[PDB]
Scaffold this active site. Structure first.
Site, PDB file in Angstrom:
ATOM      1  N   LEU B  42       3.769 -69.073  84.336  1.00  0.00           N
ATOM      2  CA  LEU B  42       4.627 -69.455  85.227  1.00  0.00           C
ATOM      3  C   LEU B  42       5.613 -68.327  85.067  1.00  0.00           C
ATOM      4  CD1 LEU B  42       6.397 -72.417  85.886  1.00  0.00           C
ATOM      5  CD2 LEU B  42       3.952 -71.806  86.311  1.00  0.00           C
ATOM      6  N   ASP B  43       6.379 -68.343  86.183  1.00  0.00           N
ATOM      7  CA  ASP B  43       7.546 -67.271  86.495  1.00  0.00           C
ATOM      8  C   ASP B  43       8.391 -66.796  86.268  1.00  0.00           C
ATOM      9  OD1 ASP B  43       5.355 -65.344  89.206  1.00  0.00           O
ATOM     10  OD2 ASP B  43       4.914 -65.458  87.135  1.00  0.00           O
ATOM     11  N   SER B  44      10.427 -66.578  85.400  1.00  0.00           N
ATOM     12  CA  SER B  44      11.525 -66.989  85.444  1.00  0.00           C
ATOM     13  C   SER B  44      12.048 -67.399  87.032  1.00  0.00           C
ATOM     14  CB  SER B  44      12.269 -65.752  84.866  1.00  0.00           C
ATOM     15  OG  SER B  44      11.888 -63.969  85.835  1.00  0.00           O
ATOM     16  N   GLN B  47      10.842 -70.760  87.077  1.00  0.00           N
ATOM     17  CA  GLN B  47      12.110 -71.674  86.582  1.00  0.00           C
ATOM     18  C   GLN B  47      13.721 -72.123  87.102  1.00  0.00           C
ATOM     19  OE1 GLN B  47      14.304 -70.581  84.301  1.00  0.00           O
ATOM     20  NE2 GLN B  47      14.515 -72.639  82.846  1.00  0.00           N
TER      21      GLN B  47
END
Ligand SMILES: CCCCCCCCCCCCCCCCCC(=O)OC[C@H](COP(=O)([O-])OCC(O)COP(=O)([O-])OC[C@@H](COC(=O)CCCCCCCCCCCCCCCCC)OC(=O)CCCCCCCCCCCCCCCCC)OC(=O)CCCCCCCCCCCCCCCCC
Ligand SMILES: CCCCCCCCCCCCCCCCCC(=O)OC[C@H](COP(=O)(O)OCCN)OC(=O)CCCCCCCCCCCCCCCCC
Lengths: 51, 88, 63, 102, 125, 606, 459, 176
Positions: B42-44, B47
């Site tokens: 996933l990506d920041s 998140q």
């Protein structure tokens, strides 16, 4: 016994007695003007001794 | 008009509900420890949006200090539990 | 705090209520008095120029 | 050699009274004394002083004549209203008995 | 756009002196952190210290009170603008109020001497 | 003539009784809230009798219960003046307070100190009834300051809500700034007429008597909400909704206007006050309506609306329709309270989210509160027959019918529109858009202690206005001769507000991205007036109290001057007179100088 | 009057010889009996003032002070019964003896006629106060504080005495009401002006203005509860009573010999009320509040109007009681903590639920919440000052506002925040201190009810 | 609010916080959740555009222009979260959030009832003194003389024994 402890409660009453007596002596002094004032000058009704 | 408190089963079911309604990367099958950046790539951004959706779902706010470090649904649940003091 | 409240209320009521009750009984039975004008044969005394019974009682006994 | 501190007892500690006399009242550590002194305070200062003092005062008569004066004013106003005089003359003392320079 | 002020300081982000990447400045930050952590740990070794029957002493608070209360006159050195502000605060306003009151009273006095000022109902004063 | 005073004292005795119970030990056994609610109900049923006897006789009454002192030709005594104003205000306030007490008994469960809350409420109530039915300006000051402190406590009931403390401090400061002018009035009257009573003051109906009027004016601006001293009304909302309604919808603000109207006899012969009552009250119908267009908090919006209505009433006073103003107070109270009641129900049902921005579909999810809220909204707009009309529309007649300043009239009508504007704002954002609130739901409104009060208050807000407008003696002479475009102006302009609010709320959609425009930012931020005042005035005043007074006068100069100067002086003189060394060769020379001196002095003086 | 004094002169040997376990209770209860007997003075049926001899007298302006003193004695006792608990019996007995000597002196002076007797007693008040302050303080600057106290007072004392002599010689006697029935008027020259000064300067130096308010905070801070009580309550009032009784002669001088003092009093009221906002030390805040109110007292004393005198007496009594009460509360919060600072202990009212209502009921009486003798006095004095000039309501109002501010600041930095977590030494309230609060309060209620007693000469 | 932050920060967290702030202010501006989602996706695209870039120059420039645009186009009255600062519940219950040590000064006539709970306090405090001194050496042994420390706290490297400094966290009252 116990009086050595429970006697102290006699002073203050005796002090108050002495105070009233001293005020009575002062008021018995200054007796002048007992009835010679100009706003309470009565006739001293019979059997009514002085203030 | 106070409703009842929250329990761990409810919290977990809700969190799975939300992370499943999510669409970007979740293959609709999330392990309780389905790590976002590691175990799901996933990506920041994703998140952070997850954290925000959870904030909206539970009313309160999650501070950045811990939003940046949460990397596990189990960790989110532990955090919520230590914040609301659940499971007497 | 419960203790202070209860004990203060006691050590007040204890003598406040008996006293107030005596006061009520006095106002009822004795009650206040009349403005009887001054006769020309009587020279009233300090315990008679005051209205309330308690007041005149004190003025007769003490002062 | 460096230095030394004047011999002195150490700073006493902060303690609790309720740990040894949960019947505390604040006066002393002797419970009987606490009890008797607080009863004395209350009685001599709540049952007698406040009550009897308030009673004495409230039943004081005509403090500084604020009642006799009302009565006297009523009577004087009756008198003067009837006799036609005014209720208050702007000159107090008889200006006849008085004498002035030029 | 935006400008600073004595009230509305320039917020954290916008501050040009922030976003700096200086190793010396970051080291200063980390030194501040070491300090603050030592302080908090010394404080927590007492907040929870069992067998304790007392409270904590705040020496910063005590020193602040000392400096506001009693360290003043010793370190005080008189100079101008200071003597000046003092004489001002001690003389000026009293005298202004005084001229005001004296003028008012003289007005009232001359008015009455003339016999004009409506004083009806001023029975209690 | 005995039943009357009996009732007028019985109401106060009833309100006392609980407070007395508070002292006792029964509370831990007894349902204090229900006790107090029912005592209040019977107090209202009592207060009703005066209304019947008064409408059937129109006989005012004046009483002097207890003689306090006799201070050398200026006496004092507990004097009541049961006239139209107070004999009606008691009944209205009780009709509201009974419902409020039920609402609280339902809304503040899970809280331990509820009996404490109830006692505080009834204490404020006693103080307000005193202020209302009081005659001696001293008794009135008593009511004034007691109301102030009660409001302080109630805003602070949660003594950890830091900003609540500051809100309470705001309130106290502004109420004291009003008390200034009030004491000014008391003093001027005690001097120029020797008495504090309205009876013996009415005889000031001929002189300039302008300073006491300015004092009462500042008192109004303070205790009510006006231009200079409104900012304390919006913050109180930080406190609970029941009190944010009672103390800030029909009480603690109407007090100033009540005072002015009781003092009206002297305001008809001062053509300056008659004016300044317009450049002060009408303005507030703008400087708050503006702030009542973007504010999100329900309670803040309602408070700004209240400030608007109070400014409107001060305007009608300025132009001399005081009985109209009073009737409007009475009516206004009903629905301005029901609104806060519904809002509190909404909130408690939800998780403490005042913000409209996170609520919707309220009609479907909760029909009752929405119906009542619509009732109140339309009544405040000025719907033709909902107890709003029967005062608002006569007021809007007079405002254009009399010689009223242009700008004042104009901003007043603009505000009459903004009423409908933000009312429909509430409607849309809360009752017509989508459910933007959280997923969980635990709604419950089938409880009687929360469903009955609103019902009673709605019946009241629908009937009492009409009842009063047709039953009161016709104080003034109206004006019923004008064109339609001046008799129906409020109606037309409120309909305009409806249409405009609909258009704009529907424009909120359409993906029309927003932009931080300065007019709207101003409106939201109140106009920046607090943002500057509360940030400079405190700072400068405190910095002066520190620099000049504390340090530069009380620790520096008043010590360096007297004591330290004496110290230095005597110290130096002692240094001199004991710098001596033990030498006879010197002591004897000194003796010789002294001998010479003495000889010379004698020689000169013979 | 001996009926009031002699027993107060017997409490001393009583204390000396009584056993430790019982001296406290015995002396306390008997002092309460004295307080009771001290009400005989209130039988003022008619206007003829009371005179007991050439050496004593009473009056409506003095009786209140007498009763207040005889009733503040036992409160000092009680509030002085938890500290010095580890100090020897002999030492605490000395303390009691000093308190009682203060009581006796204050009574004799507030009663005496001859201003010279008044003066010797007014100056004998010192020794016990100086002692109490030096030998029982808790800091080190108590020494400098006592020195300032003593020397301010004596500097005042001296020219007062010199003027009393000039009077006793020019006039035949010094007895009051003779000074009245044989007063006269003065040519109003620099001589009589400096005489006015030498007569009022001491009473003023005692009742502090802006210029000489310096010895008050040091005293009330470094000194213990009893010294603080008695200062804030009476040792100021002595100056006011002296000024009232003495100004009877100096007519007319006091019309133009007042402007500077009125100006100073008002400005000082304002500046000190302001400092009360930003003064950390609680007792210092209280002391400066006392200054702010005594300035009103002085401004009302000078101009010599009846309303003004009655307001002065009202506010005097009210402030006395209220300050004693606030100081009790401060001491209370101190014994548990041992730090006067206001911002250290915060967010109470969660563990002292009741005490607050003894905090609150004080502030409300400080900020002049009615119906209270406090506001009655403030208001009558503002009336007199408005008559004397229309441009003083300004300062009255500024003071009222700043008070309404700092009273609540004090309430809110000690009973409105959130509770600390390292104050484990919060021994709950003692019945004793609760009693002290209740006793300081209740009389305020009864006097708010019936104030005709507390009016003054003019009523 | 339990863990503490580091002294310095990083571009990463700065950008994250700007993102969250802007998205909250957008939720506040544009009420309807549909519009919120729309504009949030737009902001996400704006970010992902420059995401892959790494040059500190462009980083600082874009960040300091972004903060200015944010501060100039933010919401005057934003959406505060009740249970967090600015809201209408922050500290609302602190007036009821009493600590435990108020217990000790109870009266025995009161703790007579509630007996069970007071039967367990002792075995809790007993769980404190028996394992306090150890919690010190764990640090005084690991108080790295380097003298460069953070505010973090190490756990009980042993088993059975408890961690260090658990009192000021455990026993922290509920939120209610
Ligand atoms: C004159 C006109 C002016 C009116 C304006 C009044 C302003 C109101 C100020 C106020 O609220 O005072 C707080 C006070 C209550 O404070 P509280 O914090 O809510 O009391 C809760 C106790 O801590 C805990 O409750 P409690 O168990 O102690 O209750 C029993 C009661 C017991 O009181 C007694 O029995 C003492 C009797 C003497 O004790 C008290 O409540 C406090 C005394 O108000 C009162 O109820 C007292 C009577 C109010 C009439 C006016 C009293 C003078 C002011
Ligand atoms: C000098 C005082 C300052 C010293 C403080 C220390 C005080 C200790 C000494 C003892 C206590 C003080 C004595 C106070 C006396 C109380 C007077 C009183 O009870 O009020 C009297 C009042 C009757 O009212 P009254 O003012 O007399 O006449 C007007 C017509 N109603 O009747 C009432 O209604 C009273 C109400 C009681 C409840």
């Amino acid at each position: 016994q116990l009086l050595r402890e429970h006697w102290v409660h006699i002073l203050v009453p005796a002090g108050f007695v002495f105070g009233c007596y001293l005020d009575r002596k002062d008021d018995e002094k200054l007796t002048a003007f007992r009835n010679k004032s100009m706003l309470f000058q009565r006739e001293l009704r019979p059997n009514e001794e002085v203030t | 008009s106070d409703a009842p408190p929250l329990t761990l089963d409810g919290i977990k079911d809700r969190v799975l509900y939300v992370l499943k309604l999510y669409d970007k990367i979740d293959p609709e099958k999330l392990s309780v420890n389905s790590h976002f950046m590691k175990d799901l790539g996933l990506d920041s951004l994703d998140q952070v949006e997850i954290i925000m959706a959870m904030e909206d779902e539970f009313g309160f706010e999650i501070p950045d200090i811990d939003a940046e470090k949460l990397m596990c649904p189990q960790e989110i649940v532990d955090y919520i539990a230590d914040k609301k003091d659940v499971y007497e | 705090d419960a203790r202070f409240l209860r004990l203060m209320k006691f050590y007040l009521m204890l003598t406040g209520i008996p006293v107030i009750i005596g006061i009520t009984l006095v106002n009822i039975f004795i009650g206040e008095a009349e403005l009887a004008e001054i006769p020309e044969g009587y020279i009233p005394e300090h315990w008679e120029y005051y209205k309330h019974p308690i007041s005149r009682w004190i003025a007769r006994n003490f002062y | 050699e460096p230095t030394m501190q004047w011999q002195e007892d150490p700073e006493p500690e902060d303690e609790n009274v309720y740990a040894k006399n949960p019947d505390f009242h604040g006066y002393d550590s002797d419970p009987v004394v606490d009890v008797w002194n607080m009863r004395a305070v209350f009685f001599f200062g709540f049952s007698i002083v406040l009550v009897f003092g308030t009673t004495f005062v409230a039943y004081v008569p005509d403090y500084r004549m604020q009642e006799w004066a009302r009565r006297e004013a009523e009577r004087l106003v009756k008198y003067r209203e009837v006799n036609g005089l005014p209720i208050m003359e702007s000159n107090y003392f008889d200006p006849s008995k008085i004498q002035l320079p030029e | 756009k935006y400008k600073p002020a004595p009230l509305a300081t320039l917020p954290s982000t916008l501050d040009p002196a922030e976003y700096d990447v200086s190793p010396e400045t970051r080291r200063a930050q980390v030194e501040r952190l070491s300090i603050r952590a030592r302080l908090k740990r010394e404080y927590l070794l007492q907040y929870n210290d069992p067998k304790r029957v007392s409270h904590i002493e705040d020496p910063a608070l005590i020193r602040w009170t000392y400096a506001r209360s009693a360290n003043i006159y010793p370190n005080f050195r008189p100079t101008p603008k200071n003597s000046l502000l003092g004489a001002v605060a001690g003389f000026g306003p009293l005298i202004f109020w005084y001229y005001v009151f004296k003028t008012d009273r003289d007005r009232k006095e001359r008015l009455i001497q003339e016999g004009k000022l409506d004083r009806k109902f001023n029975i209690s004063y | 003539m005995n039943i009357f005073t009996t009732s007028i004292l019985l109401i106060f005795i009833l309100l006392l009784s609980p407070i007395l119970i508070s002292m006792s030990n029964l509370i831990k056994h007894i349902n204090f809230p229900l006790y107090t609610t029912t005592s209040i109900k019977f107090s209202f049923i009592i207060s009703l009798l005066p209304l019947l006897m008064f409408f059937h006789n129109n006989m005012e009454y004046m009483i002097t219960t207890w003689h306090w002192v006799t201070m050398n030709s200026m006496e004092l005594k507990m004097s009541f003046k049961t006239d139209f104003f107070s004999i009606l205000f008691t009944s209205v306030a009780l009709f509201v307070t009974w419902s409020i007490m039920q609402f609280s008994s339902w809304y503040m469960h899970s809280d331990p100190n509820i009996n404490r809350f109830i006692k505080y409420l009834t204490l404020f109530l006693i103080t307000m009834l005193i202020l209302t039915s009081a005659n001696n300006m001293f008794q009135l000051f008593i009511g004034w300051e007691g109301v102030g402190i009660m409001s302080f406590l109630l805003i602070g009931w949660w003594y950890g809500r830091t900003d609540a403390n500051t809100a309470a401090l705001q309130a106290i400061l502004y109420n004291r700034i009003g008390d200034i002018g009030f004491i000014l009035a008391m003093v001027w009257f005690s001097l120029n007429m020797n008495s504090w009573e309205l009876q013996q003051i009415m005889f000031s109906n001929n002189n300039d008597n302008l300073i006491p009027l300015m004092g009462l004016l500042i008192a109004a601006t303070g205790k009510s909400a006006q231009f200079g001293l409104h900012p304390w009304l919006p913050s109180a909302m930080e406190g609970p909704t029941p009190v944010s309604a009672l103390l800030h919808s029909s009480t603690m603000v109407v007090a100033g206007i009540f005072l002015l109207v009781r003092f009206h006899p002297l305001t008809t012969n001062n053509n300056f006050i008659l004016t300044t009552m317009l450049c002060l009250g009408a303005l507030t119908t703008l400087f708050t309506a503006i702030c009542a267009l973007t504010q999100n908090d329900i309670k803040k919006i309602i408070a700004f609306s209240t400030s608007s209505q109070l400014g409107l009433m001060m305007v009608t006073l300025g132009m001399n329709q005081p009985h109209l103003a009073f009737l409007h107070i009475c009516t206004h109270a009903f629905f301005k309270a029901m609104l806060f009641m519904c809002s509190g129900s909404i909130i408690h049902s939800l998780a403490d989210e005042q913000d409209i921005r996170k609520m919707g579909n309220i009609t479907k999810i909760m029909p009752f509160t929405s119906s009542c809220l619509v009732i109140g909204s339309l009544a405040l707009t000025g719907m033709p027959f909902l107890t709003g009309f029967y005062s608002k529309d006569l007021i809007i007649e007079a405002i254009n019918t009399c010689n009223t300043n242009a700008w004042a009239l104009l901003i007043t009508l603009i505000a009459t529109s903004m009423t409908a504007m933000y009312s429909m704002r509430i409607i849309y954002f809360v009752t017509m858009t989508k459910p933007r609130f959280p997923p969980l739901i635990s709604i419950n409104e089938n409880d009687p202690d929360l469903m009955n009060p609103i019902k009673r208050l709605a019946f009241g807000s629908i009937f009492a206005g009409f009842v009063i407008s047709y039953n009161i003696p016709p104080t003034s002479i109206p004006v019923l001769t004008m064109p339609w475009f001046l008799k129906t102006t409020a109606l037309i302009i409120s309909v305009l507000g409806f249409l405009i609010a609909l258009e704009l709320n529907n424009l909120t959609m359409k993906l029309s991205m927003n932009k931080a425009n300065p007019y709207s930012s101003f409106s939201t931020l109140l106009g920046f007036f607090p943002s500057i005042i509360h940030r400079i005035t405190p700072m400068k005043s405190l910095n002066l109290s520190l620099k000049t007074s504390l340090t530069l006068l009380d620790l520096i100069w008043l010590e360096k001057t007297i004591p330290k100067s004496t110290s230095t002086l005597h110290t130096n003189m002692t240094t001199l007179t004991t710098n001596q060394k033990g030498l006879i060769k010197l002591y004897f020379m000194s003796f010789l100088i002294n001998i010479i001196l003495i000889i010379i002095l004698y020689s000169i003086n013979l | 009057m001996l009926k009031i004094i002699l027993p107060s002169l017997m409490l001393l040997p009583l204390t000396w010889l009584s056993s430790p376990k019982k001296t406290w209770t015995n002396v306390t209860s008997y002092s309460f009996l004295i307080s009771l007997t001290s009400l005989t003075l209130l039988w003022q049926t008619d206007e003829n003032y009371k005179n007991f001899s050439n050496m004593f007298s009473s009056d409506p302006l003095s009786t209140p002070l007498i009763i207040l003193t005889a009733w503040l004695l036992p409160l000092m006792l009680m509030a002085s019964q938890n500290h010095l608990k580890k100090d020897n019996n002999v030492l605490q007995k000395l303390y009691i003896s000093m308190l009682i000597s203060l009581q006796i002196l204050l009574i004799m002076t507030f009663s005496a006629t001859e201003l010279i007797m008044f003066y010797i007693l007014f100056e004998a008040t010192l020794i016990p106060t100086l002692i109490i302050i030096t030998r029982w303080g808790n800091q080190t600057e108590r020494l400098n504080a006592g020195i300032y106290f003593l020397f301010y007072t004596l500097i005042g004392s001296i020219p007062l005495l010199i003027a009393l002599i000039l009077i006793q010689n020019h006039v035949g006697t010094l007895n009051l009401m003779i000074l009245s029935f044989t007063t006269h008027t003065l040519d109003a020259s620099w001589s009589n002006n400096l005489l006015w000064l030498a007569c009022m300067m001491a009473f003023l130096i005692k009742m502090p203005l802006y210029g000489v308010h310096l010895w008050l905070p040091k005293a009330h801070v470094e000194a213990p509860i009893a010294g603080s009580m008695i200062l804030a309550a009476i040792l100021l009032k002595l100056g006011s009573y002296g000024m009232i009784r003495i100004s009877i002669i100096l007519d007319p001088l006091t019309k133009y010999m007042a402007y500077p003092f009125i100006l100073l009093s008002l400005w000082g009221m304002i500046m000190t009320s302001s400092i009360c906002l930003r003064q950390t030390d609680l007792k210092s805040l209280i002391a400066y509040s006392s200054v702010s109110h005594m300035a009103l007292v002085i401004a009302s004393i000078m101009i010599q109007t009846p309303w003004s005198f009655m307001g002065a007496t009202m506010l005097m009594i009210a402030h006395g009681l209220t300050s004693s009460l606030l100081f009790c509360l401060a001491n209370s919060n101190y014994e548990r903590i041992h730090s006067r600072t206001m911002i250290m202990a915060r967010g109470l009212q969660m563990v002292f639920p009741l005490m607050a209502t003894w905090w609150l009921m004080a502030s409300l009486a400080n900020l002049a919440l009615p119906p209270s003798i406090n506001l009655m006095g403030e208001l009558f004095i503002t009336m007199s000052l408005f008559s004397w000039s229309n441009f003083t309501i300004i300062l009255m109002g500024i003071n009222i506002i700043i008070t309404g501010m700092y009273s609540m600041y004090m309430i809110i930095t000690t009973q409105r925040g959130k509770l600390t977590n390292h104050m484990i030494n919060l021994q709950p309230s003692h019945t004793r201190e609760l009693t002290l609060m209740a006793l300081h309060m209740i009389p305020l209620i009864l006097l708010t009810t019936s104030p005709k007693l507390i009016t003054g000469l003019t009523m | 609010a339990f863990c503490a932050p580091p002294a310095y920060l990083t571009h990463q967290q700065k950008v994250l916080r700007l993102y969250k702030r802007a998205l909250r202010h957008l939720e506040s501006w544009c009420i309807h959740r549909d519009k919120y989602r729309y504009f949030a996706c737009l902001m996400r695209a704006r970010f992902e555009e420059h995401k892959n870039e790494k040059d500190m120059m462009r980083a600082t420039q874009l960040l300091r222009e972004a903060e200015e645009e944010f501060w100039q186009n933010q919401h005057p009255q934003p959406y505060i979260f009740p249970d967090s600062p600015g809201g209408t519940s922050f500290e609302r219950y602190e007036c009821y959030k009493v600590p435990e040590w108020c217990l000790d000064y109870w009266h025995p006539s009161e703790k007579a009832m509630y007996p069970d709970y007071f039967s367990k306090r002792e075995q809790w405090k007993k769980l404190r003194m028996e394992s306090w001194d150890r919690e010190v050496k764990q640090l005084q042994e690991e108080t790295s003389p380097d003298g460069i420390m953070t505010e973090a706290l190490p756990p009980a490297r042993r088993e059975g024994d408890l961690p260090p400094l658990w009192w000021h966290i455990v026993t922290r009252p509920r939120e209610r």
